[PDB]
Design a protein around this ligand. Structure first.
Ligand SMILES: Cc1cccnc1-c1csc(C(=O)Nc2cc(Cl)cc(NS(C)(=O)=O)c2)c1
Ligand SMILES: Nc1ncnc2c1ncn2[C@@H]1O[C@H](COP(=O)(O)OP(=O)(O)O)[C@@H](O)[C@H]1O
Ligand SMILES: [Cl-]
Ligand SMILES: [Mg+2]
Length: 857
């Protein structure tokens, strides 16, 4: 397209030149002829040792969860024996007195894992490492940590027991901690606790179990595994990347500290790979009753329901022994869609069998669960009189999650519309019927075009077998697979482990913070090492950020980014926010990326109230900051004022509260890295009037989400950095409500995630000026004297000197970030030479700097 004309005043051009001259910053001079354009853009003590995370056993005067001495109260001097006796007696009394708890223990003693209690405890006592293998629903997760704890309590060694249980999912760590507390007559906070990203309930310091995500454990290993007797690594068969990484750390720990106890727990898969990795450790097999399950495929499903679709490809392939209508009907179904209407027809077929039982439906993600749910409540046959239809995904509230376990009024059918959470991590009771979409949801990132694909993909044969088996724990069962018999044949046996297909920059920072050695050298020792290109891309990413120096050693910037649990690029954006004294707002934007949107839109275009949060800034990120300011104001009135605020504005309160908490924790980590309190205060802003603080926040957001820049042609059509076409996401404040066109005062936009569906979509969009483009959303800039070319995709008609001056500001800003990370309290100093540079960036963040007044039309 035509080069875009930047309207830069003479006053500003000279101000830019003066600041570059005052500070003696290097500029590239204009070119000689327009056919040779010029680019405007221009060590610590290594070791090769393989470090080991140190280990030390529980100690009576040590709180292993807070990693500090017990100083106050009786536990500071109390002997192990005193502590063990008290806890032993406390437990014996509770079990004599509580009739409801006695009934709960009776349920426990009937779980299949119960009969193996002795064999498991003998195996753990005799071996540094063991594997416990058995079917989903035996009681590995809920029972085994209690068996170990109760073994120590009942043998007068309560004080010698502290257990870490890792789960691959946030929802599993929380849920399991709530379930195990309930099984012990408690709420989390006594014998059991949980620690996940941005939320914890710490257990008591003694004879306690902490359920956590691996990320939390790795972030807390900076001082070693101190005061812990057992590490239980759960659901290893999921090949969660962080679990694979932790298995490398714990193998080194075991070797150097054989008194530690590691316990790996697996579904029924081949565990020889893990077994061999951990020096041929014992495998304790665990099993109970299972019933046979009749399994059906798409063609079987079409025949027994007489179903007829509306008006390579394994739906055109069907065996001779099926009817000509089955073949014809199957052949009409797109394999990339899930057939909602066939599922409806399968629930009705199940009614005719007259055997009571719950139906578990496996759907890839929340998008198809919502769609299947709405589809059913359209037909009044699927109302409360006959049907309890419950969604199960990680984002439904925990109140709603528990309801999938509740019994149901006689003559009502429980239907769980579930993600693969219900494949191996939880067991819904009363399940006799499984409908399997035969799909998985996976996050695929591609670094080269910065494309996120929430892709719907074929499941493995091993997933289909596990899904089939969820129908066969109560009585003989049925599994209705919605893929052809000819698609089944082409299925891989296992999923690609996440280590093969996930970015490694966060794992790389953890390796460096924990001093485990070289990134490539440590990942080479993984059970299944990641591919070379992923390691090369991680090192390259952390080197562009200046998280690693020339020697690939941790910079002081690296150390901060490693300690912040968000994307490193966002960590660096928060340091820059601190330097500009807008820390709180940049911490809010970073925290919000870890949680679903607070707006309850229901996959439709935002209406008036949601759009009003945007002001005149054409920015989803400003909409979010304005929501958080209004919500925090309405919260002063108390809980009911907060609930009413969130109901009247259609906002998810739980999302607003978790984001705020996450923001509080991010800020605490910067405080502890030496950042001054007063660069992180909440600052009132307006989303319509002049606001230099908000101008700077939007500049810093361009940096954060780079390389996500786009150019708006017309309507919803945008051009991405690959020269390719894309759509403004329906959910954006920048998406036209109807046919009235938006009059953007700039065509340039930054966005959260570039999404591949059928088209390329920009989601969470913020308008930026051409000046902000050049300062923070540009890696490479070539000038011919008249026209500059930005990252080989878009052209500005702008002065050469202005573009070179803005590029030199970016470099000055990078060099200040390096200085500030060595010595964060220089933010306080407000040194005059830095202030001169910062004030010029403050000035070119103004909409007025690029000829724009957002208050006019
Ligand atoms: C609230 C608070 C006040 C003061 C200090 N700390 C916390 C805290 C917040 S979360 C948290 C945690 O998760 N600690 C934690 C988890 C895990 Cl999974 C293990 C181990 N112990 S260790 C390293 O393995 O020896 C320790 C502690
Ligand atoms: N929240 C809960 N409500 C009711 N029953 C539950 C709950 N959580 C777990 N259970 C039951 O506990 C039993 C054992 O589950 P679990 O320990 O997860 O087994 P495993 O880890 O071996 O698959 C199952 O029958 C399951 O249904
Ligand atoms: Cl950049
Ligand atoms: Mg389990």
């Amino acid at each position: 397209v035509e080069p875009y004309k930047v309207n830069l005043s003479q006053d500003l051009e000279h101000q830019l030149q003066n600041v570059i001259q005052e500070l003696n910053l290097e500029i590239v001079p204009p070119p000689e002829d327009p056919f040779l354009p010029v680019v405007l853009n221009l060590p610590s003590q290594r070791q090769n040792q393989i470090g080991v995370v140190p280990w030390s056993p529980p100690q009576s005067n040590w709180n292993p969860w807070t990693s500090s001495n017990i100083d106050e109260g009786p536990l500071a001097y109390a002997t192990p024996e005193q502590i063990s006796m008290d806890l032993k007696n406390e437990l014996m009394y509770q079990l004599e007195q509580d009739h409801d708890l006695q009934a709960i223990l009776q349920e426990r003693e009937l779980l299949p894992v119960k009969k193996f209690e002795s064999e498991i405890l003998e195996a753990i006592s005799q071996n540094s490492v063991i594997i416990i293998r058995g079917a989903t629903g035996c009681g590995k997760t809920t029972q085994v940590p209690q068996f170990i704890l109760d073994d120590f309590i009942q043998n007068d060694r309560a004080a010698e027991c502290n257990i870490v249980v890792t789960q691959p999912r946030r929802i599993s760590a929380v849920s399991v901690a709530e379930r195990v507390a309930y099984e012990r007559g408690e709420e989390p906070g006594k014998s059991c606790g949980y620690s996940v990203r941005f939320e914890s309930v710490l257990p008591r310091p003694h004879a306690s179990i902490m359920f956590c995500t691996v990320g939390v454990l790795l972030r807390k290993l900076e001082a070693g595994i101190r005061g812990i007797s057992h590490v239980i690594v759960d659901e290893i068969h999921e090949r969660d990347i962080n679990t694979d990484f932790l298995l490398v750390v714990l193998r080194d720990v075991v070797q150097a500290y054989p008194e530690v106890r590691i316990v790996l727990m697996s579904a029924t898969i081949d565990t020889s790979m893990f077994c061999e990795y951990f020096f041929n450790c014992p495998i304790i097999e665990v099993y109970g009753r299972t019933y046979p399950v009749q399994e059906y495929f798409l063609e079987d499903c079409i025949q027994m329901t007489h179903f007829v679709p509306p008006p390579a490809n394994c739906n055109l392939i069907c065996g001779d022994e099926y009817g000509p209508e089955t073949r014809m009907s199957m052949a009409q179904l797109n394999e990339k869609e899930t057939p909602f209407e066939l599922i409806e027809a399968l629930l009705k077929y199940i009614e005719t069998l007259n055997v009571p039982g719950a139906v578990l439906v496996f759907l890839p993600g929340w998008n198809l669960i919502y769609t299947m749910q709405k589809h059913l409540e359209m037909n009044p046959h699927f109302g409360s009189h006959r049907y309890q239809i419950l969604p199960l995904h990680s984002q439904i509230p925990r109140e709603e999650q528990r309801k999938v376990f509740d019994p149901v009024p006689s003559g009502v059918t429980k239907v769980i519309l579930s993600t693969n959470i219900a494949e191996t991590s939880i067991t819904i009771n009363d399940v006799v019927y499984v409908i399997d979409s035969c799909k998985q949801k996976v996050k695929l990132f591609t670094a080269h075009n910065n494309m996120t694909n929430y892709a719907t993909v074929w499941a493995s044969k091993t997933n289909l077998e596990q899904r089939k088996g969820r129908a066969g724990r109560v009585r003989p069962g049925f599994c209705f697979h919605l893929c052809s018999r000819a698609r089944f044949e082409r299925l891989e046996t296992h999923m690609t482990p996440e280590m093969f297909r996930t970015p490694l920059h966060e794992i790389a920072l953890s390796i460096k913070l924990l001093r485990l050695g070289g990134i490539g050298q440590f990942l080479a020792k993984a059970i299944e090492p990641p591919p070379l290109d992923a390691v090369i891309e991680a090192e390259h990413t952390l080197r562009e950020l200046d998280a690693l120096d020339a020697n690939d050693e941790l910079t002081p910037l690296g150390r901060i980014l490693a300690k912040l649990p968000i994307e490193p690029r966002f960590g660096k954006m928060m340091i820059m926010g601190c330097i500009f004294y807008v820390g709180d707002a940049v911490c809010t934007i970073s925290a919000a990326t870890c949680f679903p949107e607070p707006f309850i839109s229901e996959g439709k275009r935002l209406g008036y109230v949601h759009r009003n949060f945007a002001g005149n800034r054409f920015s989803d990120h400003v909409a979010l900051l304005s929501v958080f300011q209004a919500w925090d104001d309405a919260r002063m009135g108390g809980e009911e004022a907060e609930i009413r605020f969130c109901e009247h504005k259609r906002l998810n309160m739980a999302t607003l509260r978790m984001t705020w908490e996450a923001k509080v924790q991010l800020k605490e980590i910067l405080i502890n890295s030496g950042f001054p309190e007063d660069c992180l205060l909440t600052q009132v802003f307006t989303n319509t009037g002049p606001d230099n603080n908000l101008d700077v926040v939007i500049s810093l957001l361009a940096f954060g989400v780079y390389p996500n820049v786009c150019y708006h042609k017309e309507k919803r059509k945008i051009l991405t950095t690959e020269g390719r076409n894309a759509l403004i996401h329906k959910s954006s404040v920048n998406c036209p409500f109807s046919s009235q066109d938006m009059k953007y005062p700039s065509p340039f936009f930054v966005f959260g995630e570039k999404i591949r569906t059928r088209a390329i979509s920009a989601k969470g969009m913020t308008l930026v000026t051409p000046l902000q483009l050049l300062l923070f959303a540009s890696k490479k800039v070539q000038s011919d004297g008249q026209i500059v070319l930005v990252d080989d995709w878009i052209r500005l008609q702008i002065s050469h000197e202005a573009a070179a001056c803005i590029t030199a500001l970016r470099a000055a800003m990078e060099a200040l970030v390096v200085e500030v990370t060595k010595q964060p309290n220089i933010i306080s100093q407000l040194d005059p030479v830095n202030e001169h540079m910062l004030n010029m960036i403050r000035q070119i963040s103004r909409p007025s700097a690029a000829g724009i007044n957002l208050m006019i039309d």
